[PDB]
């Protein structure tokens, strides 16, 4: 369980590797590696236990992550669903949320095809 809770792929460039944490994209990755001053080109397998703890220390404290992030997103939908607003309702049926068409398509929200 390297950083933070997840063991980011060795073998790979630390900028790509950090993306394998829930809540860290291309962007937040570019940002941690500047703020902790390390080369994004270095493979994770090549990190000073020092460079690592830095990386670890910064990221865990800067941004809400892994389980704690998912919890907020759940809590966010939790409430939306319970105040009974329209965006909440669309969740309450597992349906699309962002005003998409549902006469055709809409499969990612729905699941693959459900025969009549």
């Amino acid at each position: 369980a390297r950083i933070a809770g997840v063991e980011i792929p060795r073998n790979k460039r630390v900028d790509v590797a950090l993306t394998y944490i829930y809540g860290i994209g291309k962007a937040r990755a570019k940002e941690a590696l500047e703020k902790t001053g390390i080369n994004p080109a270095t493979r994770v397998k090549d990190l000073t236990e020092a460079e690592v703890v830095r990386l670890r220390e910064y990221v865990e404290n800067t941004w809400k992550l892994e389980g704690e992030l998912r919890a907020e997103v759940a809590a966010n939908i939790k409430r939306l669903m319970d105040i009974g607003c329209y965006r909440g309702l669309r969740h309450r049926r597992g349906l699309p949320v962002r005003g998409q068409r549902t006469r055709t398509n809409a499969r990612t929200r729905k699941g693959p095809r459900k025969t009549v």
Binding site: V53, E60, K64
Partner: protein, 69 residues
């Protein structure tokens, strides 16, 4: 204990990322861990890590008062 079936226990140093060092015993003499009781949020009083928000939402929006009475 029965001989030959049990891994030896020797004095062992567990080193955390906070820079804490634990004098204990293990089957391995030197161990490096990413966290411990000295630096874990739940343990460290109540270190509210990243989210010291106070919700912040939603009454607490406040942009602004400019709608009239």
């Amino acid at each position: 204990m029965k001989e030959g079936i049990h891994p030896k226990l020797v004095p062992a140093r567990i080193i955390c990322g906070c820079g804490n060092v634990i004098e204990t015993y293990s089957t391995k003499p030197e161990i490096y861990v990413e966290v411990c009781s000295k630096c874990h949020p739940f343990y460290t009083g109540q270190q509210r890590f990243v989210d010291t928000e106070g919700r912040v939402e939603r009454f607490q929006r406040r942009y602004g008062d400019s709608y009239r009475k």
